[PDB]
Amino acid sequence: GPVGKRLQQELMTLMMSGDKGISAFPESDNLFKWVGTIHGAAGTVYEDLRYKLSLEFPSGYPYNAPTVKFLTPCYHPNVDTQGNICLDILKEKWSALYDVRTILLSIQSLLGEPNIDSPLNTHAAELWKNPTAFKKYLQETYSKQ
Amino acid sequence: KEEELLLFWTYIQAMLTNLESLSLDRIYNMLRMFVVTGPALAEIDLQELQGYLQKKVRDQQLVYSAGVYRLP
């Protein structure tokens, strides 16, 4: 299939790109469900933390955005309890040129620069302005959950 | 062939990073689907792959335990 061909190419591009602290790979059988891994960037409160994500590619992909969710519970202003991410490029700003690598780099970037005006977690949004308290709470509850 | 075997190692590292541990069979099948019949069009057979992963385990680039492979 053309969509499967496309996803094979996105995989190879990601494999060849060597971007730091991001990775992904088709989960077992299907080209249509992958697991990703994102490490928090150095300098941010997420440094030293890593998160697994699921990426599911719907009928209609590349024109229909993939469904991307945190599998690892992620305490962040823009992430809900179910692992849903409020990220512009995953909904209204989705472009059919975007690939997996783009999505992972955008989420990694969202970790260190949340959008506080569009919170899915209000506790985290309010705590964000206090980075030592945010980091302590984040690190100590990453361990709990 | 060189670009092939180094490419295989890149994909093997990602498979293991994301899926955490895999049997020889699963590694083999993923390389077949995503590399051999993938855009790279790169050939590998099972014996060669097993020898390769074994050399990686000798050199401690890979761990083999409980019948499966893992990253150290």
From Swiss-Prot, chain A:
- Fill in the PTM field for this protein: Autoubiquitinated by the APC/C complex, leading to its degradation by the proteasome. Its degradation plays a central role in APC/C regulation, allowing cyclin-A accumulation before S phase entry. APC/C substrates inhibit the autoubiquitination of UBE2C/UBCH10 but not its E2 function, hence APC/C remaining active until its substrates have been destroyed.
Active site located where? Answer: 86
- Give the enzyme class: transferase
Query: What Gene Ontology biological process does one annotation of this record name?
Result: positive regulation of exit from mitosis
* Entry keywords, A to Z: Acetylation, ATP-binding, Cell cycle, Cell division, Mitosis, Nucleotide-binding, Phosphoprotein, Transferase, Ubl conjugation, Ubl conjugation pathway
Please indicate which superkingdom the organism of origin belongs to: Eukaryota
Q: In which pathway does it act?
A: Protein modification; protein ubiquitination
All copies of domain UBC core, residue ranges: 2-145
Q: Name one GO cellular component term.
A: anaphase-promoting complex
Supply the EC number(s).
2.3.2.23, 2.3.2.24
Q: Which residues cross the membrane?
A: none
Q: Which GO terms describe its molecular function?
A: ATP binding; ubiquitin conjugating enzyme activity; ubiquitin protein ligase activity; ubiquitin-like protein ligase binding; ubiquitin-protein transferase activity
Its UniProt entry gives the catalysed reaction(s) as: S-ubiquitinyl-[E1 ubiquitin-activating enzyme]-L-cysteine + [E2 ubiquitin-conjugating enzyme]-L-cysteine = [E1 ubiquitin-activating enzyme]-L-cysteine + S-ubiquitinyl-[E2 ubiquitin-conjugating enzyme]-L-cysteine; S-ubiquitinyl-[E1 ubiquitin-activating enzyme]-L-cysteine + [acceptor protein]-L-lysine = [E1 ubiquitin-activating enzyme]-L-cysteine + N(6)-monoubiquitinyl-[acceptor protein]-L-lysine
Family membership: Belongs to the ubiquitin-conjugating enzyme family.
Role, per record: Accepts ubiquitin from the E1 complex and catalyzes its covalent attachment to other proteins. In vitro catalyzes 'Lys-11'- and 'Lys-48'-linked polyubiquitination. Acts as an essential factor of the anaphase promoting complex/cyclosome (APC/C), a cell cycle-regulated ubiquitin ligase that controls progression through mitosis. Acts by initiating 'Lys-11'-linked polyubiquitin chains on APC/C substrates, leading to the degradation of APC/C substrates by the proteasome and promoting mitotic exit.
**How is the quaternary structure described?**
Component of the APC/C complex, composed of at least 14 distinct subunits that assemble into a complex of at least 19 chains with a combined molecular mass of around 1.2 MDa. Within this complex, directly interacts with ANAPC2.
Protein's name in the database:
Ubiquitin-conjugating enzyme E2 C
**Provenance organism:** Homo sapiens
**Range of the intact protein held here:** 29 to 173 of 179
Curated annotation (Swiss-Prot), chain B:
* Source taxon at top rank: Eukaryota
Residues bearing PTM Phosphotyrosine: 64
Q: What does this protein do?
A: Together with the RING-H2 protein ANAPC11, constitutes the catalytic component of the anaphase promoting complex/cyclosome (APC/C), a cell cycle-regulated E3 ubiquitin ligase that controls progression through mitosis and the G1 phase of the cell cycle. The APC/C complex acts by mediating ubiquitination and subsequent degradation of target proteins: it mainly mediates the formation of 'Lys-11'-linked polyubiquitin chains and, to a lower extent, the formation of 'Lys-48'- and 'Lys-63'-linked polyubiquitin chains.
Quaternary context: The mammalian APC/C is composed at least of 14 distinct subunits ANAPC1, ANAPC2, CDC27/APC3, ANAPC4, ANAPC5, CDC16/APC6, ANAPC7, CDC23/APC8, ANAPC10, ANAPC11, CDC26/APC12, ANAPC13, ANAPC15 and ANAPC16 that assemble into a complex of at least 19 chains with a combined molecular mass of around 1.2 MDa; APC/C interacts with FZR1 and FBXO5. In the context of the APC/C complex, directly interacts with UBE2C and UBE2S. Interacts (via cullin domain) with ANAPC11 and with UBCH10. Interacts with NEUROD2. Interacts with FBXO43; the interaction is direct.
In which family does this protein belong, per the annotation? Belongs to the cullin family.
- Protein name per Swiss-Prot or TrEMBL: Anaphase-promoting complex subunit 2
